[PDB]
Design a protein around this ligand. Structure first.
Ligand SMILES: *[C@@H]1O[C@H](CO)[C@@H](O)[C@H](O)[C@H]1NC(C)=O
Ligand SMILES: *[C@@H]1O[C@H](CO)[C@@H](O)[C@H](O)[C@H]1NC(C)=O
Lengths: 190, 594
């Protein structure tokens, strides 16, 4: 058969960065021509595996994440990076083996009046360990007084993404699909 | 958590919300500027309203972090910029009265009209008719009549409003932990907190006075030459002792001497160079001028320009349909959106203005990486200095020959150099004493050395001793002659232009020094020189993070205002003027009266 790689790149909508979506693509025959056939990619990196040597490699689990970020925040999707995304939203392990694919999507993620349906986390008590999800909207207390609600020294942790078609190039939406390759002692199915 | 940490996580939320609300306000203003419609006046107004509300709630929440415990310089600067009480420190009724008086001032100045002579239908407005009749005129009577009529129609109806406005603004400034309104305006050129680079308002006054004292010889020689030239064309009207009439000087207020070239040309046989015919012969459209400007900027070393600058910004007049305004402005919406609003044609003026606005655009792209409250020039004369140095570099004959607007067989002579130097001097060095005198008068009026009942006689005295122009007719104290200027009636500062010229000449000298140029300074060119571009960008990227005394030092090697580069620029003209007016008298005596 064929791997469900098409339904990941061809999704009608993409989840937010602070709440990304992970799908396991085990138990299928890898093709990779679907990912090689899509639109030109603003970025295409793979650490650990050669792009061409992907056909003969046998793996047991292939994960596929999906989110939407800005243009100048794409460079933070890499092992050993510091920023607002790599600390609180999405972190990759220092030992990584997979490909990172991104492509500009301005025609689909711009409402000309504020596409406030995309959110990211800017305030957190501690950094995020690799491959962790944190979906919470509890008030963040930055002062020395207990917080009874929104007000002085009490902020909403999330921050909205406002996307417009007239923005620059670093403030435009970019859909990112990373492909983490996991190798285990169990027999390989991919 | 300490106070520096609370300040830091409060200043990040401000930054995000503010960039969004400013983009919406600015896109609303562009849509109004590019297309005038009541819906557009309506939306400009609603978005401005939401921005002002945010700013005030955040400056009322930003008052809980004292500056005595903040150590970081950038955080302290942002908090200081966000903690200003402003006009809100006044009472509600007083604030409303001040706003109404400012609004009525703007309305009377904008819609002021003189129609007394002949039938009332003979109505002449300022911009269409008065400026046109003042730019070119050969009759004494009409110029004197226009001057007196405008001065009366302004002062007679504007003096009490100016008195009330002065009193209210002085009270507000005193309540704002200052000395007067002049001190409030002078607080911009202030550095405090870093050792080695410190400044004060009195230091600024002393520096301005010292620079004017150093520069006075050149202006005296230029004034003597101008008076000698005007004697022949306008006989039996100017005494040789000096003090040319204020009205008989070109511009309505005599801010510039640009339109005096037709009467003060050194050599009429050799005309100044022009490339309008060259541009129109090669079918140069509005796109090619900006393409060539971008090519020059990228040849210097600065980066290219985004596509959104090409698709979004408009560069040509949209015709009778969809009327707009033609004022060349470099728009910076903030979220990676840079646009230019201007209608261009085949003219040298547009060719230079393209580079002038592209300089501001490059500055904006350079400092766009700074936080929201630190995205500005170090002073108010830093943007214009960059614009004018790029314009100066783009107008050299060598550059014009290189780009292709002039024949390669063309040759330059000393007569053309003298003509160009005099053209530059009539605009740059001819507007410094007027600015200095006006700013000094405003400072003394605001602070209190000037009696309330003595406002016009001392103004004319200072104009006589400093600028060197007398009143054509006596004026009683009821008049409010200074208020006729656009800047004073609309609450604007004026020292910015003096500071801008003094900074721009230093910047040009320092930049073309590093390009390995040998010869006169006025022929310096920066094309095809990456070192100068890198040196300029090093200060461009700073923004307002560092004090101006350090940004200035990073480029020219000096941390203060200097006038030596300005005198070096006009050295051949100074020598020629010294050689010229050796038979005529030099200087003026204020004893002349009508
Ligand atoms: C998905 O695939 C279809 C056809 O395979 C194509 O028309 C479409 O542009 C792709 N992308 C989206 C977002 O639907
Ligand atoms: C996202 O992940 C969920 C499980 O977390 C899965 O059920 C779903 O199919 C994925 N895709 C979309 C578009 O929701």
């Amino acid at each position: 058969n064929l791997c469900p790689f098409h339904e990941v790149f061809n999704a009608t909508t993409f989840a937010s960065v602070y709440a990304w979506n992970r799908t396991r693509i085990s138990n299928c025959v890898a093709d990779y021509s679907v990912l090689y056939n899509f639109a030109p990619f603003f970025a295409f990196k793979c650490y650990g595996v050669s792009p061409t040597k992907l056909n003969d490699l046998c793996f047991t689990n292939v994960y596929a994440d999906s989110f939407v970020i800005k243009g100048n925040e794409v460079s933070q999707i890499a092992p050993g990076q510091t920023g607002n995304i790599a600390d609180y939203n999405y972190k990759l392990p220092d030992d990584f083996t997979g490909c990172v694919i991104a492509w500009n999507s301005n025609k689909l993620d711009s409402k000309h009046s504020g596409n406030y349906d995309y959110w990211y986390r800017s305030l957190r008590k501690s950094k995020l360990k690799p491959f962790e999800r944190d979906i919470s909207t509890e008030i963040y207390q930055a002062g020395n007084k207990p917080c009874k609600g929104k007000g002085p020294n009490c902020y909403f942790p999330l921050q909205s993404y406002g996307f417009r078609p007239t923005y620059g190039v670093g403030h435009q939406p970019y859909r990112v699909v990373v492909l983490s390759f996991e190798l285990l002692h169990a027999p390989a199915t991919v | 958590s300490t106070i520096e940490e609370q300040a830091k996580t409060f200043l990040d939320k401000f930054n995000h919300e503010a960039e969004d609300l400013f983009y919406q306000s600015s896109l609303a203003s562009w849509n109004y500027n590019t297309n005038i419609t009541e819906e557009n006046v309506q939306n400009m107004n609603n978005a401005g309203d939401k921005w002002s509300a945010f700013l005030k709630e955040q400056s009322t929440l930003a008052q809980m972090y004292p500056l005595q415990e903040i150590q970081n310089l950038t955080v302290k600067l942002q908090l200081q910029a966000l903690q200003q009480n402003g006009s809100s420190v006044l009472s509600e009724d007083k604030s409303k009265r001040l706003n109404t008086i400012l609004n009525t001032m703007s309305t009377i100045y904008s819609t002021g009209k003189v129609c007394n002579p002949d039938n009332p239908q003979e109505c002449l407005l300022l911009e269409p008719g008065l400026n046109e009749i003042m730019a070119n005129s050969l009759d004494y009577n009409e110029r004197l009549w226009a001057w007196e009529s405008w001065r009366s129609e302004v002062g007679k109806q504007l003096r009490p409003l100016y008195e009330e406005y002065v009193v209210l603004k002085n009270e507000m400034a005193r309540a704002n932990h200052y000395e007067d309104y002049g001190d409030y305006w002078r607080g911009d050129y202030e550095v405090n907190g870093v050792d080695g680079y410190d400044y004060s308002r009195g230091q600024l006054i002393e520096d301005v006075e010292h620079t004017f004292e150093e520069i006075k010889p050149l202006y005296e020689h230029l004034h003597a030459y101008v008076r000698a030239k005007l004697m022949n064309a306008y006989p039996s009207y100017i005494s040789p002792i000096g003090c040319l009439p204020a009205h008989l000087l070109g511009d309505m207020w005599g801010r510039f001497w640009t339109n005096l070239y037709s009467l003060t040309v050194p050599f009429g046989q050799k005309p100044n160079i022009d490339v309008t015919d060259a541009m129109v012969d090669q079918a140069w459209d509005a796109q090619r001028i900006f393409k060539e400007a971008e090519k020059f900027f990228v040849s210097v070393g600065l980066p290219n320009m985004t596509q959104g600058f090409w698709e979004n910004s408009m560069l040509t007049d949209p015709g009778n349909v969809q009327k707009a305004v033609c004022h060349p402005t470099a728009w910076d919406l903030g979220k990676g959106d840079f646009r230019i609003l201007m209608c261009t044609k085949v003219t040298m003026d547009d060719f230079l203005t393209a580079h002038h606005e592209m300089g501001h655009i490059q500055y904006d792209m350079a400092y766009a990486a700074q936080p929201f409250l630190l995205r500005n020039g170090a002073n108010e004369g830093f943007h214009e200095a960059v614009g004018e140095i790029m314009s100066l570099s783009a107008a050299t004959p060598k550059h014009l020959k290189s780009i292709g607007l002039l024949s390669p067989d063309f040759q330059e002579d000393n007569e053309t150099e003298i003509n160009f130097l005099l053209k530059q001097a009539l605009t740059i060095v001819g507007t410094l004493p007027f600015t200095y005198m006006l700013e000094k008068w405003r400072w003394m009026v605001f602070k209190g050395e000037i009696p309330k009942d003595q406002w016009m006689k001392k103004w004319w005295e200072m104009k006589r001793e400093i600028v060197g122009v007398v009143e054509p007719v006596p004026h009683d104290e009821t008049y409010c002659d200074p208020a006729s200027l656009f800047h004073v009636s609309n609450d604007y500062s004026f020292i910015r232009y003096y500071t801008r010229t003094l900074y721009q000449f230093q910047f040009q000298e320092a930049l073309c020094q590093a390009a390995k140029h040998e010869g006169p300074l006025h022929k310096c060119d920066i094309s095809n020189s990456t070192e100068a571009g890198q040196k300029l960008f090093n200060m461009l990227r700073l923004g307002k993070s560092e004090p101006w005394t350090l940004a200035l030092e990073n480029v020219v090697g000096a941390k203060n205002m200097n006038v030596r580069p300005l005198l070096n620029y006009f050295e051949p003209l100074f020598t020629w003027l010294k050689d010229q007016n050796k038979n005529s008298f030099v200087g003026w005596s204020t004893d002349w009266s009508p």
